[PDB]
Amino acid sequence: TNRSLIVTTLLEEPFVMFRKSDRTLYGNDRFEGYCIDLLKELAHILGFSYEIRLVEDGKYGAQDDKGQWNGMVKELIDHKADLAVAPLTITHVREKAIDFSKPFMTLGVSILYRKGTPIDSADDLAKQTKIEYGAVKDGATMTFFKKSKISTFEKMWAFMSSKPSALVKNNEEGIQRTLTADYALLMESTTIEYITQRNCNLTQIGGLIDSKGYGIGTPMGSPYRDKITIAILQLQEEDKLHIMKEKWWRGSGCP
């Protein structure tokens, strides 16, 4: 098979971003970031070409009450894309719809909040309402709380899903909310690490709530899944993914 693979993705710093230039850019040249470096490395190793496209609805992917998916997950289900290359969380619920490569990065859910009120955990959030909290709508973190059998997280989901402001359109909007309101954002730990190094009034609250990985998504039965997995595992063993992360995360710290 010689054709270029269609890659669906989402803007999400520092994984996928619009490259800065004075020229009007087009095609793959528009994009840079951790996930673009990973895609280039896989493309080199495995000898394939690709065309990157932004998912129209700007969502990662979750199910509605009818069971229908949206976001990048839906793109893969409909075979509108060959690969989803993004910080896409590997979950068993999504495995009902799509396949994933093995993880290229591990992480956990944690809390992003303004330094100030010394809350120390999700339990501190769960037992009150003065500090509002939420997550990105139709993402893995939202779904984690929605499906949780943990009593504290159930309480949190009950509040989140009743407060129409709590679930934000995207990470950026969630971060802005933490900066402008008494609001704590439930979000993934490596992104929190990135944010708190650049926004010194924000901090991570508590440790990791859980453990998971980001993987490259594919339609079920993709002929590319297995070779992508092998290449990712190799890059991981040779510490190439650690170096790639250091590349995109490094910068000046905070006082």
C-alpha dist (Å) from residue 171 to 135, 151, 186: 8, 26, 10
Cβ-contact 80, 6 below 8 angstroms: yes
User: C-beta of 99: minimal distance to K ion in Å?
Assistant: 22
User: C-beta of 2: minimal distance to K ion in Å?
Assistant: 5
203 is in an annotated binding site: no
Applying CB under 5 A, among 19, 40, 49, 246 the residue interacting with K ion is 49
Residues 139-144: contacts with CB under 8 Å, at least 24 apart: 139/59, 139/60, 139/62, 139/89, 140/60, 140/89, 140/91, 140/94, 140/188, 140/212, 141/89, 141/109, 141/186, 141/187, 141/188, 142/62, 142/167, 143/62, 143/63, 143/91, 143/93, 144/91, 144/109, 144/210
89 is in an annotated binding site: yes
140 is in an annotated binding site: yes
User: C-beta of 141: minimal distance to ligand 2QE in Å?
Assistant: 3
Nearer to ligand 2QE, 82 or 138 (CB): 138
Nearer to ligand 2QE, 14 or 222 (CB): 14
User: C-beta of 54: minimal distance to K ion in Å?
Assistant: 16
| 21 near K ion (CB under 5 A) | yes
The entry of ligand 2QE, K ion, none near residue 14 (CB within 5 to 8 angstroms by kind) is: none
Q: What is the 3-state secondary structure (H, E, C) of 15-41?
A: CEEECCCCCCCCHHHHEECHHHHHHHH
Site string for K ion, 144-183 (x = CB under 5 A): ----------------------------------------
106 is in an annotated binding site: no
The site for ligand 2QE (CB under 6 A) is made up of 12, 60, 87-89, 135-136, 139-141, 171, 187-188, 191
| 1 near K ion (CB under 5 A) | no
DSSP sequence for 44-83: HHHT--EEEEE-TT-----B-TTS-B-HHHHHHHTTS-SE
The entry of ligand 2QE, K ion, none near residue 141 (CB within 5 to 8 angstroms by kind) is: ligand 2QE
Cβ-contact 133, 174 below 8 angstroms: no
Binding residues for L-glutamate: 87, 89, 94, 140-141, 188
**Annotated binding-site members:** 87, 89, 94, 140-141, 188
Interaction site with K ion (CB under 5 A): 2, 21, 49
